[PDB]
Amino acid sequence: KSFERCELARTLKRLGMDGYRGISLANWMCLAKWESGYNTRATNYNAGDRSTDYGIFQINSRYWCNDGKTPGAVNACHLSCSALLQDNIADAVACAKRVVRDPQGIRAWVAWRNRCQNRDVRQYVQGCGV
């Protein structure tokens, strides 16, 4: 499914993402926007390291979820990558929370560094009632 902007914003807020490890909801919105355009089925195969990015946050199979086909990979979120392709994003959120509990925090995603870091991200949550 493709979320509407404010629909996703409230969905993320209800899931406890607002200020999680110091990350504002607007930053999470900007991340989802640039990673998948708010789409839960988005996938990207990386031919170089044989990994795949899954779902709304485009989480990578090399370290975060298990898809059984990524060489020498681990599963830090302890989830089948299938859980990251559900319309209900609860599992994807729990995994994103896991990702930011690591040292880099929200910087784990290069897209956030490119499109959100040091940028005005207010626009992602304006008028959503969050």
Side-chain angles (χ1 to χ4, degrees):
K1 68 166 287 174
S2 279
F3 278 87
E4 289 279 70
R5 181 175 67 90
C6 293
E7 182 196 359
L8 176 63
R10 286 188 295 279
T11 296
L12 296 178
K13 188 166 185 185
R14 287 191 310 258
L15 287 171
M17 292 287 253
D18 198 359
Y20 185 84
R21 294 287 149 116
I23 303 159
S24 68
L25 199 71
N27 275 288
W28 286 123
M29 286 297 291
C30 184
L31 173 69
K33 181 58 162 201
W34 289 99
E35 286 298 348
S36 67
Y38 312 141
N39 189 88
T40 62
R41 294 187 60 253
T43 53
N44 175 66
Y45 179 58
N46 300 290
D49 79 324
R50 304 178 138 113
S51 62
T52 300
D53 302 312
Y54 296 84
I56 198 164
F57 297 122
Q58 288 292 274
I59 290 162
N60 190 263
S61 67
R62 175 150 300 288
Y63 318 98
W64 311 104
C65 63
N66 181 48
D67 65 2
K69 59 179 183 186
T70 307
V74 287
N75 182 6
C77 291
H78 296 92
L79 288 173
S80 162
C81 297
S82 176
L84 306 183
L85 298 176
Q86 295 176 82
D87 273 17
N88 179 286
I89 64 173
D91 290 321
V93 160
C95 186
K97 283 175 180 183
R98 170 61 187 85
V99 177
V100 303
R101 288 202 295 274
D102 263 17
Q104 292 188 293
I106 188 76
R107 286 161 164 72
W109 291 270
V110 188
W112 179 86
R113 295 181 223 168
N114 294 341
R115 315 277 179 173
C116 315
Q117 181 177 181
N118 300 130
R119 300 204 190 200
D120 192 331
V121 292
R122 280 179 305 161
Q123 60 180 316
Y124 296 98
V125 296
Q126 298 303 263
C128 304
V130 298

